[PDB]
Each structure stands twice: as C-alpha cells, then as structure tokens.
Design an enzyme around this catalytic site. Sequence first.
Site, PDB file in Angstrom:
ATOM      1  N   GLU A  58       0.822  -1.193   0.000  1.00 14.02           N
ATOM      2  CA  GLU A  58       0.000   0.000   0.000  1.00 14.02           C
ATOM      3  C   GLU A  58       0.865   1.255   0.000  1.00 14.02           C
ATOM      4  O   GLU A  58       0.678   2.132  -0.840  1.00 14.02           O
ATOM      5  CB  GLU A  58      -0.970   0.018   1.187  1.00 14.02           C
ATOM      6  CG  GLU A  58      -1.973   1.148   1.071  1.00 14.02           C
ATOM      7  CD  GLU A  58      -3.094   1.104   2.076  1.00 14.02           C
ATOM      8  OE1 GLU A  58      -2.822   0.902   3.277  1.00 14.02           O
ATOM      9  OE2 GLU A  58      -4.258   1.333   1.673  1.00 14.02           O
ATOM     10  N   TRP A  80      -7.654  -3.046  -2.024  1.00 14.30           N
ATOM     11  CA  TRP A  80      -8.341  -1.887  -2.595  1.00 14.30           C
ATOM     12  C   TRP A  80      -9.348  -2.246  -3.697  1.00 14.30           C
ATOM     13  O   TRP A  80     -10.231  -1.427  -4.041  1.00 14.30           O
ATOM     14  CB  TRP A  80      -7.349  -0.818  -3.053  1.00 14.30           C
ATOM     15  CG  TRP A  80      -6.960   0.110  -1.978  1.00 14.30           C
ATOM     16  CD1 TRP A  80      -5.843   0.039  -1.208  1.00 14.30           C
ATOM     17  CD2 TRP A  80      -7.692   1.260  -1.517  1.00 14.30           C
ATOM     18  NE1 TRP A  80      -5.817   1.080  -0.300  1.00 14.30           N
ATOM     19  CE2 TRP A  80      -6.943   1.838  -0.464  1.00 14.30           C
ATOM     20  CE3 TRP A  80      -8.897   1.862  -1.900  1.00 14.30           C
ATOM     21  CZ2 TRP A  80      -7.352   2.986   0.206  1.00 14.30           C
ATOM     22  CZ3 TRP A  80      -9.315   3.008  -1.220  1.00 14.30           C
ATOM     23  CH2 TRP A  80      -8.536   3.555  -0.171  1.00 14.30           C
ATOM     24  N   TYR A  94      -5.501   8.964  -1.571  1.00 14.77           N
ATOM     25  CA  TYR A  94      -4.236   9.254  -0.851  1.00 14.77           C
ATOM     26  C   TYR A  94      -3.003   9.585  -1.664  1.00 14.77           C
ATOM     27  O   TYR A  94      -2.505  10.706  -1.612  1.00 14.77           O
ATOM     28  CB  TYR A  94      -3.897   8.128   0.097  1.00 14.77           C
ATOM     29  CG  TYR A  94      -5.000   7.814   1.079  1.00 14.77           C
ATOM     30  CD1 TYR A  94      -5.149   8.545   2.278  1.00 14.77           C
ATOM     31  CD2 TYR A  94      -5.891   6.784   0.827  1.00 14.77           C
ATOM     32  CE1 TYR A  94      -6.175   8.249   3.173  1.00 14.77           C
ATOM     33  CE2 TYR A  94      -6.906   6.484   1.714  1.00 14.77           C
ATOM     34  CZ  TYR A  94      -7.046   7.209   2.877  1.00 14.77           C
ATOM     35  OH  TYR A  94      -8.074   6.883   3.731  1.00 14.77           O
ATOM     36  N   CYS A 146      -9.188   8.734   5.118  1.00 15.18           N
ATOM     37  CA  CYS A 146      -9.322   8.416   6.526  1.00 15.18           C
ATOM     38  C   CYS A 146      -8.154   8.967   7.316  1.00 15.18           C
ATOM     39  O   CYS A 146      -8.328   9.838   8.119  1.00 15.18           O
ATOM     40  CB  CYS A 146      -9.394   6.908   6.703  1.00 15.18           C
ATOM     41  SG  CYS A 146     -10.497   6.342   8.025  1.00 15.18           S
ATOM     42  N   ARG A 166      -9.152  10.603  10.933  1.00 12.59           N
ATOM     43  CA  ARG A 166     -10.505  11.002  11.323  1.00 12.59           C
ATOM     44  C   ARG A 166     -11.336   9.923  11.978  1.00 12.59           C
ATOM     45  O   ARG A 166     -12.072  10.196  12.891  1.00 12.59           O
ATOM     46  CB  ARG A 166     -11.279  11.633  10.168  1.00 12.59           C
ATOM     47  CG  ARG A 166     -11.634  10.721   9.075  1.00 12.59           C
ATOM     48  CD  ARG A 166     -12.511  11.424   8.064  1.00 12.59           C
ATOM     49  NE  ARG A 166     -12.668  10.571   6.906  1.00 12.59           N
ATOM     50  CZ  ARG A 166     -13.399   9.455   6.906  1.00 12.59           C
ATOM     51  NH1 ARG A 166     -14.077   9.107   8.004  1.00 12.59           N
ATOM     52  NH2 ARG A 166     -13.457   8.685   5.811  1.00 12.59           N
ATOM     53  N   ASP A 169     -11.486   2.235  12.920  1.00 12.22           N
ATOM     54  CA  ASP A 169     -11.855   0.885  13.283  1.00 12.22           C
ATOM     55  C   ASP A 169     -10.744   0.315  14.172  1.00 12.22           C
ATOM     56  O   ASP A 169      -9.773  -0.310  13.678  1.00 12.22           O
ATOM     57  CB  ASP A 169     -11.982   0.043  12.006  1.00 12.22           C
ATOM     58  CG  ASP A 169     -12.455  -1.392  12.271  1.00 12.22           C
ATOM     59  OD1 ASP A 169     -12.154  -1.976  13.342  1.00 12.22           O
ATOM     60  OD2 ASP A 169     -13.125  -1.946  11.383  1.00 12.22           O
TER      61      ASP A 169
HETATM   62  O1  LIG Z   1      -7.295   3.589   6.926  1.00 16.04           O
HETATM   63  C1  LIG Z   1      -8.421   3.346   7.374  1.00 16.04           C
HETATM   64  C2  LIG Z   1      -9.561   3.491   6.574  1.00 16.04           C
HETATM   65  C3  LIG Z   1     -10.814   3.222   7.126  1.00 16.04           C
HETATM   66  N1  LIG Z   1     -10.942   2.813   8.445  1.00 16.04           N
HETATM   67  C4  LIG Z   1     -12.268   2.455   8.987  1.00 16.04           C
HETATM   68  C5  LIG Z   1     -12.880   3.405  10.007  1.00 16.04           C
HETATM   69  C6  LIG Z   1     -14.374   3.336   9.665  1.00 16.04           C
HETATM   70  O2  LIG Z   1     -15.033   2.272  10.317  1.00 16.04           O
HETATM   71  C7  LIG Z   1     -14.398   3.012   8.191  1.00 16.04           C
HETATM   72  C8  LIG Z   1     -14.486   4.289   7.388  1.00 16.04           C
HETATM   73  O3  LIG Z   1     -15.842   4.650   7.363  1.00 16.04           O
HETATM   74  P1  LIG Z   1     -16.324   6.157   7.629  1.00 16.04           P
HETATM   75  O4  LIG Z   1     -15.610   6.665   8.843  1.00 16.04           O
HETATM   76  O5  LIG Z   1     -16.052   7.041   6.410  1.00 16.04           O
HETATM   77  O6  LIG Z   1     -17.809   6.076   7.895  1.00 16.04           O
HETATM   78  O7  LIG Z   1     -13.188   2.347   7.916  1.00 16.04           O
HETATM   79  C9  LIG Z   1      -9.796   2.643   9.239  1.00 16.04           C
HETATM   80  O8  LIG Z   1      -9.889   2.265  10.418  1.00 16.04           O
HETATM   81  N2  LIG Z   1      -8.537   2.935   8.701  1.00 16.04           N
END
Ligand SMILES: O=c1ccn([C@H]2C[C@H](O)[C@@H](COP(=O)(O)O)O2)c(=O)[nH]1
Lengths: 258, 260
Positions: A58, A80, A94, A146, A166, A169
């Site tokens: 990545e 992806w 990105y 993200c 932002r 998970d």
């Molecule tokens: O690099 C990343 C990209 C995405 N997410 C997770 C967080 C969220 O659960 C989801 C993104 O969804 P939204 O926040 O846009 O709803 O994927 C991550 O943890 N890391």
Amino acid sequence: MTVPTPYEDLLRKIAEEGSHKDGTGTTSLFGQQIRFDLNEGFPLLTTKKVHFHSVVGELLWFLQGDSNVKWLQDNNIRIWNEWADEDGELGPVYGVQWRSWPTPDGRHIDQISGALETLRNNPDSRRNIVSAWNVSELENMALPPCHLLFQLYVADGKLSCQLYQRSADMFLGVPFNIASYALLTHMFAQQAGLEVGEFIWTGGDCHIYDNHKEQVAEQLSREARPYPTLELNKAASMFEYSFDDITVSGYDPHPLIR
Amino acid sequence: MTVPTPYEDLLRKIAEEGSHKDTGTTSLFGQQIRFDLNEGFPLLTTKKVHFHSVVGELLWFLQGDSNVKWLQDNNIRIWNEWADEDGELGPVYGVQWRSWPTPDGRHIDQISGALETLRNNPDSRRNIVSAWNVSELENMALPPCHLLFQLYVADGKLSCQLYQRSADMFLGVPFNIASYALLTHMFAQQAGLEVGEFIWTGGDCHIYDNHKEQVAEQLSREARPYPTLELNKAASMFEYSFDDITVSGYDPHPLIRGKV
Ligand SMILES: O=c1ccn([C@H]2C[C@H](O)[C@@H](COP(=O)(O)O)O2)c(=O)[nH]1
Ligand SMILES: O=c1ccn([C@H]2C[C@H](O)[C@@H](COP(=O)(O)O)O2)c(=O)[nH]1
C-alpha cells in the site's frame, strides 16, 4: 520489562468507557492519541498477526501517486479491489494528493518530495504538513480519506511523525494504519539521514464495531511479545523503495483473530 | 472542588521535558489537551485572557472575508501587520471555511456543510472542516496554523477536535482554545445539541525563550474556576454579534505580559 501497549491500552479504554452509536453498532471515544518510541521497537502489533506485506505494498503505491489499483494486484494485494471501478481506477485518493495535489494553473504540488526538501533544508520548520483532505476533490474519490494528514518534526537529529486520522476501526484498521505510518516515517528519516523519534497516532472517532466484541475481548487477554525490529535498505530516493529493501525481524505475533 | 488545568499541565510538561533549539524555543511534538465544556468555559484563569478579541476574530472568520476592514472597524488590529495597502490578506482561515474554491469554478461552504450534517447525519465520522488548502497556501499572507477540526456527537453532546501544527504555548494557544471552545458552543447551540469535550491536539508545541519568567509566574499560580459562557441563540451561525456573547464570573489572576 514490560512491553509497552499503547494500542491495546486504548483498545481496552474504549471498550470500558466508550459510548454507543448506531449500519452495524459501535462503541466510540473521540480524540484519542497513541504514541510509540520508534527506537524502542517497530510497532507491528504482536497480540495478533498483522500482515506486513500489504502494509508495505500500500505505502510504496501511495508513494507512486497512482490511483489505479493494478500495481497492487500485480503484487498480490487485493485490499483496494472492492472500491475500484471496472478499469481498476479509484479517483484521486491518498497517493494522488500526496504527489500531485492539483493547482488552478496547469500544475500540481508534490507534497512528498516537498516535505523531503524541507527536512533537509529546514528541519525546524513548523509547517511540514502533507494533507490528503483536499476538500475540492473528495467527490471524485472512491472513498473519502481516513488518515488524512501528518506532520514532520525534528529534535535532536531524530524525526517524529504525527498522523491525524478522522475515523478508526480500532480492531481491523488502526493496527494496519500505525504500521504503515511508522514505516513511512522510517523512510523519511533514512532519506534525510536522521534517527527516528516518535510516531504519534491521533484519531477522531476511535471505535469498535459491535461485531468485534468477542475478538477484541480475546486479543485483550493475550500478553504482548516484544516488537520486531525494522530492517531497511536505503533506496536511492523516497520513490525507489522496493519490497526487497523492507523487512521486519523477530516478529512473533499471536495467531490472527478473524 | 478541583480545577482541571490541562493547559498549564502541558505548559509544565514542555518546560520540564521539552527540547531546546535556536530567538530560541523549548518544544515537544504531538500533544493533546482536553476540556469538559460542560465543566465551564476554558478561558484561562491563571492569567487574564482578553476575550472580546477572540470573539471578534471568530465572527470575522465566519463571515468569510479576505479583508481586514471589519476588524479594524471593531478595534482589532491583530492582523494589521499582515495586510497589503488594500487590507487584503489572501484566502486565509475564513475564506477556506466558507468558500474553498472548486476546480469546476464553485466554492464549498464547509461551515454550512458541517452544520448540515450535524443536523442530518450527526453520527457521521466525516464532519471535517479544513483551512489547509495546499493549492492556495501560497496566496496566503500567512499559512494556516489552527488548520483543521473535526466535529463528533456522543450522547446528544457535541465535541470538537482541533489539529494545530504549531503552538506558541504562552501567547497564542490560550486564544486558540478560547476561540475553538466558543466555536464548538456556537455549533452545538444551532444544532440544538449539548456540549461534550474540546480537544486541542498540537504539532510543534513550544515555549519561546523570551517567555521563561512569564511562564514560571503563570505556573506558580493556583487556578480558579472557569467562567461560564452565556450565549444567545442568534438566527444562524453567521448572525452572531458581540451582544450575543459574554462570559460571566471571570476571576483571572493579573494580566501577564509578553511580546513576540
Ligand atoms: O485507513 C483506514 C480506513 C478506514 N478505516 C475504517 C474506520 C471506519 O469504520 C471506516 C471508514 O468509514 P467512515 O468513517 O467514512 O464512515 O473504515 C480505518 O480504520 N482505517
Ligand atoms: O493561531 C496561531 C497562529 C500562530 N501561532 C504561533 C505558532 C508559532 O510560534 C507562530 C507561527 O509561526 P510559524 O510556526 O509558522 O513559524 O505563531 C499560534 O500560537 N497560534
């Protein structure tokens, strides 16, 4: 004596004191912060198997600044895929902002090589920022960014990196996100002849989906092993690293969950 | 009945543990401060923080004007050294908040957008507002410093995290906190939400050398309870006035003075 667990610590904290939001459920806390002394081990989590090859692929591809998924597939990385269109293209995500944030002349800004020049020429700069949160191009992205901005900083000939992310998970995304920026920050330091300081991960909505409760509860019962250490052969530039230059040694994660 | 002092805590930490440099600074990177906004208004009491100015700059940001004039006409000279003959600044802060230029020739109102989604999609994990328009950076008198923020809603309570790349811990940061705290209040009142936390995450957090004594004086003062913010529900986010914003029960230790 012992192994630091800033990640699992946050993991736990959210599970115990997160509040609950509601297409599957989550428990979240907002505005948290994790940090690793990079000299003190490479933060590839050991309480579960984090697949490093995809972390690296990545990143190398982010750095190529290309928005087609091909080069990932050609290298056996399909993470992806689901977001690609028929032609394998994702919009200006990105890497594309990182190397080629468009300007209203005919041109584009290369914040990466931009960021590098200011490490070498001006390490005290308080404005060494890369951003992928290009408001005006979000509509064209498969998926809004993200991990959307990071800042570089130098103290005693040692580079630190802070990431603003932002939404997190906690269980599936974060560990992967942190191993990826830890590595980029190692690449930056090597390409400017500096030691490594800290990686600081800073998040918005740090969340656990309801369907991870058991998995999280599991990882949380394991004791951590020491982090592996990163081995990095110096490429000729930020943009000419290959898989062969990049390995972890001494990585002994517990088995995967899921 | 203990007064949280996260600002002063970080100050103390930077003085104690920070890293000296060369007009010099001692610094730490990637630091965070949080206030419970329901616990009072984070207007520092370990020194008198001037508020009217904070309120002034905010209203100005939110009307989204490149020009300095409205601020001059309200006794706020703080941007005067940066503006050209015409009082023009380039598309700094408020211009990006209200009118981030699109390549299709339009403009994104991010403030409105944020409010819109506070109302319609409060759970959203994408309520971002940004001033770091890489493509306009070079038209700006000064590059943005408090440069992005995120809104989040917990249990009817609104929270705001600010990312600030560079922090004059003594001189600029207390204004920055006041400003963003008031900002989050304005969002919450209009969205019909209560208030959760304000979170200040900074990049390069420094104490300038010429502020050593001023910082020890400040650190030497026991802190007083935060004033409470009395805010009057104006018609929109863009219709607020000085009449609308006052702070009550504000009991600061004496003004401490420093220059730049
Ligand atoms: O690099 C990343 C990209 C995405 N997410 C997770 C967080 C969220 O659960 C989801 C993104 O969804 P939204 O926040 O846009 O709803 O994927 C991550 O943890 N890391
Ligand atoms: O809202 C602001 C804007 C600037 N600064 C401080 C940080 C730096 O000390 C200086 C900005 O200069 P540079 O870091 O960009 O050099 O002012 C603040 O504290 N708050």
